[PDB]
Amino acid sequence: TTTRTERNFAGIGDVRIVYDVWTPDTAPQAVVVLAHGLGEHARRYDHVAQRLGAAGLVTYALDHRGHGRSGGARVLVRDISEYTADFDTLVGIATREYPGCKRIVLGHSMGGGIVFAYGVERPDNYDLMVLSAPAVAAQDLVSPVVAVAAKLLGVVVPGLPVQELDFTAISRDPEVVQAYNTDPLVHHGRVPAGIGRALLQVGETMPRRAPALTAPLLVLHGTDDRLIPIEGSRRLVECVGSADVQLKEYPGLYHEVFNEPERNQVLDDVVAWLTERL
Ligand SMILES: O=C(c1ccc(-c2cnc(-c3cccc(OC(F)(F)F)c3)o2)cc1)N1CC[C@@H](O)C1
């Protein structure tokens, strides 16, 4: 059994950042610090934390600013460093509470871009990285017109909507799509300029900064992901400095591999990989 404790801290700008700590009833083997993606929140990761907890891992998971239970204007950000700074605070909380534990940083989609950006800035502050469909090549997905709009408007009017996404592509399971669309904590609007700018900041610098990532790296990606094409993860694993880097491709899976019907197999793979490398 893994128990959830809800806490908060003051993020950049004195925003209230809510986070969960999931603690198993066994001696802790390592600590996972988890970053969710755009428009969602950490309580879409209960089952992930519970599965990791069965492996003896403690999971810290925040709601990013403008998401879920945390404060701030919804999906408002001006710079990727807002997200990575708050992520860094959570890593520091985990480090102080479990100083004898290795640290795993885990991110999905936009959260994978956040974790990647954190990981190249602080490569000695964690031991292992796991990324689910990381949004690290957004420049391939944003048209030239809204790339200009996002880069010129993203700090002046970060809340300005510039594009809509097909949430029905998050999963092959209609129950997952339905639960997403009815979740009051999920953002159901358009993607705003500030998010676009932050996504472009990660993607434009990924090839030049990826060599600084030398920790063991596991990337998970569904081959039928229509939100973040798998080619971006294939490029990522070619650019990182890590010698111990793997991309596990899941044939037929959609974007949210941790929520797909095969999620217990995906999570078995993650736990097996972590077990070998801790
Ligand atoms: O984090 C993510 C996420 C997934 C996918 C994209 C994505 C793909 N293509 C664009 C995109 C493309 C053009 C303009 C644009 O607008 C912007 F220029 F950015 F303003 C954005 O965004 C972004 C975030 N998710 C999905 C739900 C949950 O699984 C967590």
Curated annotation (Swiss-Prot):
Inhibited by the serine esterase inhibitors PMSF (100%), E600 (80%) and THL (22%). Virtual screening identified a tautomer of ZINC13451138, known inhibitor for HIV-1 integrase, as a potential inhibitor. Gene3D superfamilies: alpha/beta hydrolase (3.40.50.1820). Keywords: Cell wall, Hydrolase, Lipid degradation, Lipid metabolism, Pharmaceutical, Secreted, Virulence. Optimum temperature is 55 degrees Celsius. The activity increases 3-fold in a linear fashion from 25 to 50 degrees Celsius before decreasing slowly at higher temperatures. Its EC number is 3.1.1.23. SUPFAM superfamilies: alpha/beta-Hydrolases. Coiled coil: none annotated. It catalyses: a 1-acylglycerol + H2O = glycerol + a fatty acid + H(+); Hydrolyzes glycerol monoesters of long-chain fatty acids; 1-butyrylglycerol + H2O = butanoate + glycerol + H(+); 1-octanoylglycerol + H2O = octanoate + glycerol + H(+). It is found in: Secreted, Cell wall; Secreted. This is Monoacylglycerol lipase. It comes from Mycobacterium tuberculosis (strain ATCC 25618 / H37Rv).
